[PDB]
C-alpha cells in the first residue's frame, strides 16, 4: 500500500 498523505488545507 502507498504511503498516504492528507489533503493540504
Amino acid at each position: 500500500a502507498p504511503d498516504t498523505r492528507p489533503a493540504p488545507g
Epitope: 500500500a1 502507498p2 504511503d3 498516504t4 498523505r5 489533503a7 493540504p8 488545507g9
Partner: antibody, heavy 122, light 114 residues
C-alpha cells in the same frame, strides 16, 4: 501565472548556515505540498523533504534529518529551507517545487523554482 | 528507499527516430486492483529546472505533446518519444511516489547521432 521565485545564489564557509527562500504566486499556497529537491554538480535529483504550508508540518529524507529545516510564512506565501553545518558535499542547486495532490499522494512536481546555487568552500 | 534504475544512461538518436528509454523499480509501484502506477517522468535540459511530462506512469501533463508516451506496470516502465525533435534532447528522469522518500532514477541523456 504560477511562479516560484527562489532567492539569490549563495557562497559560504564550511560550518555556516544558509536560509533559502521560495516566494510562491499565482495559486493558493496552502493547497499544495511544497517539496525541496537538490542537484549536486553534474548529478541526478534527490528529494530533501516536504512541508504542508497550511499547518507547517514536515517530513525529511533520512539523509537530511539534521541538515535541513523547513518553514513557511503564510501571509507572504514563502517557503524557507535552512541548511546547517554546511560541508562542501552540500554544494549544489537547491529547488523548491509544487506537488499536485490526488489519490492520497503527491503525484507530480509541476512547477519548479529556477533553483538556488549554494557553494561551500573555505 | 525504492531504487529506480534507468537504462541506458546515454542514448544517441536521429531527428525523426522513435526512441524508448527504460525505468525499472525495486518494488512494485502498482497499487492493488486500482490499475494506478505511482510513477512520473521529468525532462531536464541543461541550465534549466526539471519539467514534469508524465504522471501515473502514462498520463501526460497538460501542454506536453502526445509524441511522449509513458507505459508499463509494476516494476518495468518505459518512456517513448515517437518522433524525436532537436528540442527533445535532454536528460529524462523517472520518479516513484509510492513510498517516502520519493526517489528518482539516474537519468537517461539523449544526444544526437552523427
Amino acid at each position: 501565472q504560477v511562479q516560484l521565485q527562489q532567492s539569490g545564489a549563495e557562497l559560504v564557509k564550511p560550518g555556516a548556515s544558509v536560509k533559502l527562500s521560495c516566494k510562491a504566486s499565482g495559486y493558493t499556497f496552502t493547497n499544495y505540498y511544497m517539496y525541496w529537491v537538490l542537484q549536486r554538480p553534474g548529478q541526478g535529483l534527490e528529494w530533501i523533504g516536504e512541508i504542508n504550508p497550511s499547518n507547517g508540518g514536515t517530513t525529511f529524507n533520512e539523509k537530511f534529518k539534521n541538515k535541513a529545516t523547513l518553514t513557511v510564512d503564510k501571509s507572504s506565501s514563502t517557503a524557507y529551507m535552512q541548511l546547517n553545518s554546511l560541508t562542501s558535499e552540500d554544494s549544489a542547486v537547491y529547488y523548491c517545487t509544487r506537488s499536485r495532490y490526488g489519490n492520497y499522494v503527491n503525484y507530480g512536481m509541476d512547477y519548479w523554482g529556477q533553483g538556488t546555487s549554494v557553494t561551500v568552500s573555505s | 528507499d525504492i531504487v529506480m534504475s534507468q537504462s541506458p544512461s546515454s542514448l544517441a538518436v536521429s531527428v525523426g527516430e522513435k526512441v524508448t528509454m527504460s525505468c525499472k523499480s525495486s518494488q512494485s509501484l502498482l497499487y492493488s486492483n486500482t490499475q494506478k502506477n505511482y510513477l512520473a517522468w521529468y525532462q531536464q535540459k541543461p541550465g534549466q529546472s526539471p519539467k514534469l511530462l508524465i504522471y501515473w506512469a502514462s498520463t501526460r501533463e497538460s501542454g506536453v505533446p502526445d509524441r511522449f508516451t509513458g507505459s508499463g506496470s509494476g516494476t518495468d516502465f518505459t518512456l517513448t518519444i515517437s518522433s524525436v525533435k532537436a528540442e527533445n534532447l535532454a536528460v529524462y528522469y523517472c520518479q516513484q511516489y509510492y513510498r517516502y522518500p520519493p526517489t528518482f532514477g539516474g537519468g537517461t541523456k539523449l544526444e544526437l547521432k552523427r
